[PDB]
Amino acid sequence: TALQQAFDTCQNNKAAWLQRKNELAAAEQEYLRLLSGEGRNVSRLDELRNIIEVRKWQVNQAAGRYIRSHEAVQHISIRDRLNDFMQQHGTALAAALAPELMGYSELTAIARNCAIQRATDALREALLSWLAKGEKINYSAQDSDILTTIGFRPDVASVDDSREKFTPAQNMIFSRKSAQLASRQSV
Amino acid sequence: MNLTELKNTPVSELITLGENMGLENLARMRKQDIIFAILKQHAKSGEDIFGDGVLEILQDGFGFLRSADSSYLAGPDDIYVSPSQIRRFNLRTGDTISGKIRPPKEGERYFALLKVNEVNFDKPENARNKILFENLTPLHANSRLRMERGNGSTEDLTARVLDLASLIGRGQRGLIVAPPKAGKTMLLQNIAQSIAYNHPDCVLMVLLIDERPEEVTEMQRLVKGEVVASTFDEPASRHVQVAEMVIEKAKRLVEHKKDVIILLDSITRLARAYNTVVPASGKVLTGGVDANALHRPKRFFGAARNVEEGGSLTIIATALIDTGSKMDEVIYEEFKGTGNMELHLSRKIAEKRVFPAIDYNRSGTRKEELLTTQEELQKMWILRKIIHPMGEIDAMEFLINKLAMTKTNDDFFEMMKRS
Amino acid sequence: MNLTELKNTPVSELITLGENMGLENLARMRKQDIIFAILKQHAKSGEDIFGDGVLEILQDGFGFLRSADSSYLAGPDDIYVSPSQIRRFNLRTGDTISGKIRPPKEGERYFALLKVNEVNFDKPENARNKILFENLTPLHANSRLRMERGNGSTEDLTARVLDLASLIGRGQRGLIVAPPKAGKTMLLQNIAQSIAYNHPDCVLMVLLIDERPEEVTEMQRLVKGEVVASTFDEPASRHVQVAEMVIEKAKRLVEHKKDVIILLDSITRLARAYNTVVPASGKVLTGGVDANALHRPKRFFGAARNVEEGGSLTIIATALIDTGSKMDEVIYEEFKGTGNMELHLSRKIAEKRVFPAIDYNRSGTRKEELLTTQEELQKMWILRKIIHPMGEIDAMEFLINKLAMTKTNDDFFEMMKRS
Ligand SMILES: Nc1ncnc2c1ncn2[C@@H]1O[C@H](COP(=O)(O)OP(=O)(O)OP(O)(O)=S)[C@@H](O)[C@H]1O
Ligand SMILES: Nc1ncnc2c1ncn2[C@@H]1O[C@H](COP(=O)(O)OP(=O)(O)OP(O)(O)=S)[C@@H](O)[C@H]1O
Ligand SMILES: [Mg+2]
Ligand SMILES: [Mg+2]
């Protein structure tokens, strides 16, 4: 049930990121509206600048968390599908790669790592040949519906909001400012 | 009518009004005497009249209602407040009282109040259920209080310099130290105008200790907010009691989730007055100052704070250094690390006459991250890094030269970053 | 209804409970008066009431019982303790006493004690048979007190630097020497967090002298162990009282084989308070400090020891240097070699805003061989040897870079030795 946990955590991250983008857009729109108005709410102007900055940081953090969750669920799906397919076809897979595999079966550490590297780059050119002749690739039914629900790749709105990084000093100062914002909203 | 309506009127309008109505002699009496006479006559006329003021309790529970218009001088114009209503409606010092007032009873020199209908800018039954100021939990200042007017005035540049030198926070505690003849008064007026022009909502209070009269009269005709100033003619006891009155008024106003800003000039003079008034405790430190003498000014200066549920008290005080009397140096040493805001002025900058005479390198604000947005933190950090190694006189010259040609602070930042 | 639990709840709940309990007003006075009124009403209701606190002995057995929630402030909420009970159960200052409390009869206004049911978190009979802190043989620190949080955070980096700068163990006597605005407050924050996270068993208390109220509130709402602070508003007498109360409570706790940790900010302010409160002995040193005036703080700072019988008392007191006041470096000279651990901070590193700003070469500990192991001792030795040449700013930049590259201290050491 770990795959389902990854799936619904990714859905929760998507919902949270969409929500954060929603109030960020709302705050930006209201700030621009106050700029349009002639009335000088300068204190409110600085407050709104603080709000939009901290909510932009929150949106960036939520998008990053969504990216990590999507990568984690994709990795879990790969682990599961590769594991049972390899359990199905392992006899023939090892027959194809008998030398290095039974070398790893009993050898020194460096020789074992060399055998693993040889197996990995052998499968390198195998996969490159397969993708060079270029057939169409599809998922597996249950993982097919799950990963069509979550999508092949995260949305471009999730990646463009995470292209900028924050120094750790900025990280905890923005965390404190977000806590102050939460306290202010509680008031 | 209201007492403040005819108290604030000039002596000429008052003399004409007193002569038109027909009272015999009005020429050789003060504001208070004329006000008392005309109010007594209007009382015996029979019409209903109102009164205004702020309350004070004496050592025996006796209540006096002063008024800030007359610079808090004590006189018979102050309104009678019997213990009956100070106990019934649990009032205390700093409360503003308005409502029905009573003519003085035969044998009483003080006008009384029939009843109160408006206290602390709120209905009386709501004002009773409040929270005490010392029961509130302080906070770091987080609401930015920008000083740049943005109108492109000649003096606005000076204010702009402060917006580049040290931040201003709502509910912040600060000191601006300066030697004599450095421009303290002009900076105070600039701050007051910026407060009245950018943030009209917040309550602005200016307090002046033992200042010579002409700057006082300038203040009453320059600052929109009410100003309380006592000249050096008055004794130090009046100085300390008016300081207590102002701070208590500010605390009571903050109690109602209302922002209050106090401008002090000077904290050193107030400390000297307290040392004069407070009896010696037998432990006289260096400079001829009692150990307990500076305890009260510390409380007054530390009353500034920022509150959880709302309301804040901002105090900006001036301290004198290099005055030739080293007791002032002792006072400044005792007040070295108390303030969040630290601003410095120097004689050498003012000798070259560049204004404002602000020492940029040694002036700054602590915990400034919570005040404003990050990107201008890096902007000001770059500016401070590029201005720090080079000298202070040249620092002010460079700053004024590259700030006058621009329009606003963001324009200055963009101009400096493009170059 | 515990007195402590009602003290913990904020003022609004106190007012609501008072209104629900048929009590009028109780909205425009201090917390102690509200608590006194609530307790009087509950006593008049008739139900039994019990409390707790810390004992204080006056000059004639006129015993008092304070509470750490109110920072040991003298108020109506304090509990009377008669000399009869003191002579009966053999109490002294600093004892933690909890038990039944009594409403006051006519002629007195302070709660008494019906009977005591817990002394120093122990049975009262076993509390009397305890050896004094002065009769316990000191030793060198043995158990290492690791500061590495280990949760893989980013502020823990500072704590990690601590494990690279100066080892801290149970019973250290340490001084944090730092200029103004160098990171003392949040360095103490990190130390307190590490103490409360890695070592939940040891008792942690943070003492703050003449600190601004906002910093006090930030301290209280972050640390886990109980914290006591006195602002600069209060006189130096209260500073001395609070310091003495804290040290006596720590001694009483460590008398029960407990591990007590005290964080002091700052020892310079406490020394100033003692100097301005102790009567002059006629022999004044440079800076205006009396000769014996520094005798009292040293005792407070001299209690840090590792008891052979059991338990330990660690004290980490920070000191201020380069503050522009001669008294500060006079006090620093009088406290230079007294401590066995030193942590030097420099404004030069903080100017470049690289944190933590630690003078690594000057900072260190004394005979750490009894604290740590050997192989990591040579790891630290070679790290010091390779970090000795370059300047402090470059050293800290290199250290933070390498520490950010790795994950834990062991990972840092293995990465350093493999390259
Ligand atoms: N921003 C400014 N623009 C023009 N003139 C200024 C400015 N600031 C100060 N000055 C001049 O500086 C001189 C001193 O101004 P003040 O503020 O009265 O000095 P001060 O700091 O109050 O010191 P005291 O009160 O006389 S001991 C006056 O001639 C002012 O005109
Ligand atoms: N580990 C850290 N991470 C991020 N910022 C830090 C760190 N240490 C210090 N700072 C910054 O450096 C300053 C340290 O402030 P404080 O610790 O409050 O100064 P201080 O040492 O307490 O001296 P005082 O009491 O203010 S005179 C702040 O501007 C912090 O943002
Ligand atoms: Mg002046
Ligand atoms: Mg600090």
Side-chain angles (χ1 to χ4, degrees):
Chain A
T1 187
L3 172 66
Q4 185 58 43
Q5 298 188 342
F7 170 69
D8 63 358
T9 48
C10 189
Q11 291 307 98
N12 290 318
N13 290 120
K14 168 63 70 68
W17 166 69
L18 285 182
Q19 184 178 2
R20 298 288 182 269
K21 279 198 75 72
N22 189 359
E23 71 268 13
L24 172 61
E28 182 65 26
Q29 185 174 355
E30 196 270 331
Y31 172 70
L32 183 63
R33 197 258 294 160
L34 282 183
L35 271 295
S36 66
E38 190 276 331
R40 296 179 296 164
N41 296 114
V42 55
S43 51
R44 197 70 175 94
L45 278 188
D46 294 277
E47 183 178 1
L48 280 184
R49 206 174 281 97
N50 189 359
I51 301 299
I52 62 170
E53 182 65 26
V54 64
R55 294 188 185 280
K56 186 195 305 312
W57 171 86
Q58 275 188 331
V59 166
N60 168 274
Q61 180 170 106
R65 188 176 297 111
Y66 172 44
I67 299 297
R68 279 83 58 84
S69 176
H70 184 273
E71 294 294 328
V73 63
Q74 274 204 346
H75 159 87
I76 290 296
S77 74
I78 298 299
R79 188 270 299 164
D80 189 358
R81 281 311 101 185
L82 183 63
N83 200 308
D84 47 349
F85 157 82
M86 183 278 288
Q87 191 67 36
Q88 172 63 259
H89 284 125
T91 71
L93 183 60
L97 307 163
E100 291 83 2
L101 273 287
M102 64 184 73
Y104 172 80
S105 84
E106 182 65 26
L107 260 185
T108 61
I110 188 66
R112 285 188 290 103
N113 296 115
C114 292
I116 301 299
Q117 292 333 288
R118 278 195 280 277
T120 48
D121 63 358
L123 291 172
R124 185 63 42 63
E125 84 270 11
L127 269 295
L128 275 296
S129 66
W130 173 273
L131 274 299
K133 64 182 181 292
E135 291 83 4
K136 187 269 183 181
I137 300 92
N138 189 359
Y139 293 103
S140 161
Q142 53 183 21
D143 285 332
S144 178
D145 83 0
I146 287 171
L147 275 72
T148 45
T149 300
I150 68 170
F152 169 52
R153 276 300 168 266
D155 291 331
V156 298
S158 306
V159 65
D160 63 358
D161 291 331
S162 312
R163 68 180 65 252
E164 54 90 19
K165 300 289 94 176
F166 284 116
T167 188
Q170 279 179 269
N171 275 99
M172 73 290 291
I173 193 66
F174 274 123
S175 70
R176 185 179 296 113
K177 294 173 75 68
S178 63
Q180 270 171 18
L181 184 146
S183 182
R184 177 62 177 163
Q185 291 178 155
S186 295
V187 165
Chain B
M1 73 291 291
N2 296 295
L3 183 63
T4 62
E5 290 180 353
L6 73 165
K7 182 180 283 185
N8 77 353
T9 58
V11 295
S12 295
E13 191 277 331
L14 213 45
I15 193 67
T16 59
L17 188 152
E19 290 146 349
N20 289 340
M21 60 79 71
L23 194 153
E24 294 177 350
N25 192 38
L26 278 297
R28 301 308 175 160
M29 283 73 74
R30 297 173 323 131
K31 279 73 176 175
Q32 188 274 330
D33 289 352
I34 301 299
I35 285 296
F36 180 44
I38 193 66
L39 183 63
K40 181 70 175 178
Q41 188 275 331
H42 274 59
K44 64 182 181 293
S45 89
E47 64 184 342
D48 193 83
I49 57 173
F50 291 165
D52 291 331
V54 63
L55 194 147
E56 182 183 3
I57 299 97
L58 277 296
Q59 70 276 17
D60 60 356
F62 196 29
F64 274 79
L65 193 72
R66 280 83 167 91
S67 88
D69 291 331
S70 70
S71 179
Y72 285 134
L73 277 296
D77 60 355
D78 296 330
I79 300 302
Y80 194 49
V81 173
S82 84
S84 66
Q85 67 273 18
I86 195 67
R87 186 267 182 275
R88 190 266 300 165
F89 182 75
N90 71 17
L91 286 171
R92 61 186 63 251
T93 308
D95 282 310
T96 61
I97 301 299
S98 52
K100 299 291 184 183
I101 62 170
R102 186 181 65 82
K105 182 62 66 68
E106 294 294 328
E108 181 65 27
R109 281 82 65 193
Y110 294 123
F111 267 77
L113 75 164
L114 294 174
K115 66 183 291 294
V116 59
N117 69 343
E118 168 49 77
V119 56
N120 290 318
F121 294 164
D122 207 314
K123 203 268 182 182
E125 70 91 19
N126 313 112
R128 151 177 317 261
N129 302 323
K130 270 301 160 294
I131 318 293
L132 183 63
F133 187 67
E134 296 90 354
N135 264 29
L136 314 176
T137 68
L139 281 176
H140 288 276
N142 48 52
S143 178
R144 171 66 192 279
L145 207 71
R146 192 170 301 274
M147 299 288 75
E148 171 174 60
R149 317 156 185 216
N151 50 34
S153 300
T154 297
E155 84 284 358
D156 202 359
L157 188 148
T158 62
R160 291 167 84 214
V161 171
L162 282 72
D163 270 329
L164 294 174
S166 78
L167 277 297
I168 303 298
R170 203 184 306 277
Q172 198 175 3
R173 172 179 35 245
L175 287 172
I176 62 170
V177 298
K181 295 179 177 67
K184 297 185 291 295
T185 302
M186 294 299 291
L187 192 149
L188 267 291
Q189 308 169 197
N190 290 319
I191 290 297
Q193 301 168 204
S194 174
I195 295 298
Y197 181 53
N198 270 326
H199 324 266
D201 47 354
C202 71
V203 185
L204 172 58
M205 293 180 183
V206 178
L207 191 153
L208 308 170
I209 295 282
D210 79 341
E211 205 75 351
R212 60 185 70 87
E214 55 270 20
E215 299 87 320
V216 174
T217 61
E218 185 178 2
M219 298 297 222
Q220 282 98 24
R221 69 180 65 252
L222 193 144
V223 299
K224 300 289 94 176
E226 61 86 20
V227 55
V228 190
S230 87
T231 61
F232 57 86
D233 291 331
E234 288 105 313
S237 190
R238 202 197 167 288
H239 292 353
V240 299
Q241 63 84 30
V242 73
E244 294 293 328
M245 188 87 57
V246 161
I247 196 51
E248 199 73 25
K249 173 67 180 294
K251 289 164 69 175
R252 297 294 166 267
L253 262 190
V254 165
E255 273 188 351
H256 289 271
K257 301 181 178 56
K258 194 166 299 315
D259 311 332
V260 177
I261 298 173
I262 299 181
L263 278 297
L264 183 63
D265 189 358
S266 174
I267 199 159
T268 311
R269 294 275 92 102
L270 179 56
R272 280 173 34 83
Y274 263 108
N275 166 47
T276 302
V277 176
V278 172
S281 86
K283 173 55 72 189
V284 166
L285 277 296
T286 186
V289 291
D290 188 22
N292 290 318
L294 282 72
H295 160 245
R296 319 291 320 284
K298 283 185 180 293
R299 295 191 71 253
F300 169 84
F301 187 64
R305 50 183 40 97
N306 177 23
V307 193
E308 291 278 64
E309 69 275 16
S312 70
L313 166 61
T314 316
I315 294 181
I316 292 150
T318 75
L320 276 296
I321 58 170
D322 289 3
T323 62
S325 178
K326 64 90 175 179
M327 65 179 288
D328 295 338
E329 182 65 26
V330 171
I331 291 161
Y332 161 67
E333 154 182 356
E334 288 295 320
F335 284 163
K336 230 165 200 173
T338 61
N340 299 295
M341 183 177 176
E342 183 178 1
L343 178 54
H344 293 179
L345 283 74
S346 67
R347 185 177 65 246
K348 183 164 69 69
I349 303 314
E351 294 294 328
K352 280 73 176 175
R353 198 167 295 152
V354 54
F355 289 138
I358 286 181
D359 201 335
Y360 197 71
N361 297 334
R362 68 180 65 252
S363 283
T365 298
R366 80 180 77 246
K367 205 62 67 179
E368 70 275 16
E369 293 83 3
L370 319 178
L371 276 184
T372 67
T373 77
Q374 206 58 227
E375 69 275 16
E376 66 168 346
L377 271 296
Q378 293 83 18
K379 289 170 200 171
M380 308 165 27
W381 279 346
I382 288 170
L383 166 78
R384 191 180 311 268
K385 180 67 174 66
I386 62 170
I387 201 167
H388 174 277
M390 61 80 71
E392 44 179 358
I393 293 171
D394 296 325
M396 294 298 102
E397 294 294 328
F398 182 76
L399 183 63
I400 62 170
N401 290 318
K402 271 71 179 175
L403 189 64
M405 65 179 288
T406 75
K407 179 66 175 66
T408 59
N409 299 334
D410 58 356
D411 276 17
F412 177 63
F413 287 141
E414 190 276 331
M415 183 278 288
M416 185 63 72
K417 64 90 176 179
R418 59 90 174 173
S419 64
Chain C
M1 185 180 288
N2 303 50
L3 184 145
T4 299
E5 70 183 1
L6 59 87
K7 280 190 172 180
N8 297 123
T9 72
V11 177
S12 54
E13 291 80 25
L14 294 174
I15 297 170
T16 300
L17 177 63
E19 292 177 350
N20 300 338
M21 275 177 36
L23 267 174
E24 59 88 21
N25 279 358
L26 295 199
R28 269 170 95 82
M29 72 291 291
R30 295 179 66 250
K31 183 184 286 291
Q32 292 85 0
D33 292 330
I34 297 169
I35 284 163
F36 197 38
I38 299 300
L39 265 286
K40 293 297 293 296
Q41 201 68 357
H42 206 320
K44 299 289 94 176
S45 65
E47 291 84 4
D48 68 305
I49 54 171
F50 42 82
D52 57 355
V54 173
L55 185 68
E56 177 179 1
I57 300 299
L58 270 298
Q59 79 292 334
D60 56 354
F62 184 76
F64 264 113
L65 190 139
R66 300 283 189 267
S67 87
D69 189 358
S70 88
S71 176
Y72 305 129
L73 182 62
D77 63 358
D78 303 346
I79 299 182
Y80 190 98
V81 177
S82 65
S84 79
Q85 287 138 350
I86 296 298
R87 185 179 296 113
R88 185 179 296 113
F89 307 105
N90 193 0
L91 273 68
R92 64 177 61 251
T93 318
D95 279 320
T96 309
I97 310 302
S98 75
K100 300 289 94 175
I101 62 171
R102 187 191 62 80
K105 300 289 94 176
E106 72 283 334
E108 87 269 13
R109 65 179 64 88
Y110 282 150
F111 285 170
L113 296 174
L114 294 174
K115 52 185 304 298
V116 297
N117 64 8
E118 200 76 23
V119 174
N120 288 324
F121 318 128
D122 206 313
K123 187 176 186 292
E125 272 68 29
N126 297 332
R128 315 195 324 281
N129 313 136
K130 280 301 178 301
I131 313 299
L132 274 295
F133 181 72
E134 293 83 3
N135 298 347
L136 296 173
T137 80
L139 291 178
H140 283 273
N142 295 322
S143 174
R144 162 77 167 284
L145 205 70
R146 195 169 296 270
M147 295 296 172
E148 176 158 61
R149 208 166 303 167
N151 52 16
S153 88
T154 176
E155 55 270 16
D156 168 64
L157 183 65
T158 61
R160 289 170 91 222
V161 177
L162 267 184
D163 287 330
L164 269 69
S166 88
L167 308 185
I168 307 183
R170 301 182 188 277
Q172 294 297 109
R173 177 165 36 239
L175 283 172
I176 300 175
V177 172
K181 302 173 188 62
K184 284 184 294 295
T185 299
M186 64 184 73
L187 190 149
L188 269 298
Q189 296 294 321
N190 286 164
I191 286 187
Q193 283 181 196
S194 279
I195 292 300
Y197 176 85
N198 283 9
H199 311 278
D201 51 352
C202 65
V203 178
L204 168 63
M205 64 184 73
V206 193
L207 171 52
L208 301 176
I209 306 298
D210 72 3
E211 183 97 5
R212 329 178 192 93
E214 50 270 38
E215 298 273 41
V216 171
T217 56
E218 190 276 331
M219 185 64 73
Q220 307 186 330
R221 302 198 322 185
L222 193 151
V223 305
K224 299 289 95 176
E226 61 86 20
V227 63
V228 57
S230 83
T231 79
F232 54 81
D233 291 331
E234 290 85 3
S237 83
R238 190 163 189 288
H239 296 285
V240 169
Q241 157 193 354
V242 171
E244 269 151 16
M245 185 64 72
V246 168
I247 194 58
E248 290 302 318
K249 184 177 180 183
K251 287 178 184 179
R252 294 299 98 75
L253 272 187
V254 73
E255 276 170 345
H256 288 259
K257 302 176 176 51
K258 298 266 200 177
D259 288 347
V260 189
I261 298 182
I262 300 185
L263 307 182
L264 176 62
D265 187 1
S266 182
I267 201 159
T268 303
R269 320 293 329 179
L270 181 56
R272 283 180 177 266
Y274 269 115
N275 169 42
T276 189
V277 75
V278 170
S281 74
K283 178 70 175 178
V284 61
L285 294 174
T286 61
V289 295
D290 193 17
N292 60 5
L294 283 195
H295 157 62
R296 307 282 305 282
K298 286 182 180 291
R299 276 171 58 76
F300 180 92
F301 184 75
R305 66 185 67 188
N306 183 3
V307 172
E308 186 171 57
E309 279 78 10
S312 66
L313 177 42
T314 313
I315 292 183
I316 309 298
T318 185
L320 279 73
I321 62 153
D322 189 358
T323 47
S325 168
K326 65 179 72 66
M327 185 180 288
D328 295 350
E329 69 275 16
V330 172
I331 293 166
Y332 175 48
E333 297 315 346
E334 294 293 328
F335 276 92
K336 184 179 288 293
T338 187
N340 47 53
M341 184 277 287
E342 67 203 347
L343 184 64
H344 285 267
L345 315 192
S346 67
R347 68 180 65 252
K348 204 188 296 183
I349 296 175
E351 275 179 354
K352 287 188 41 64
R353 294 177 180 88
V354 174
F355 304 107
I358 295 188
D359 205 332
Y360 186 117
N361 305 327
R362 294 179 66 188
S363 58
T365 181
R366 280 185 211 253
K367 65 179 73 175
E368 67 273 17
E369 301 98 13
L370 317 179
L371 288 184
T372 187
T373 71
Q374 211 79 33
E375 68 275 16
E376 78 162 354
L377 195 47
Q378 288 93 23
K379 293 174 194 172
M380 285 161 34
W381 269 352
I382 62 170
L383 169 65
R384 282 188 159 278
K385 182 175 73 175
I386 62 170
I387 204 167
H388 183 278
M390 73 291 291
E392 65 274 16
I393 314 182
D394 291 331
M396 194 66 53
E397 290 184 312
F398 163 83
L399 213 67
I400 62 170
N401 189 359
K402 292 300 165 300
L403 279 169
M405 293 177 71
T406 81
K407 171 66 174 65
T408 58
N409 262 342
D410 293 331
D411 292 331
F412 170 74
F413 286 136
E414 61 86 20
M415 183 278 288
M416 294 299 291
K417 65 182 181 293
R418 67 180 291 275
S419 63

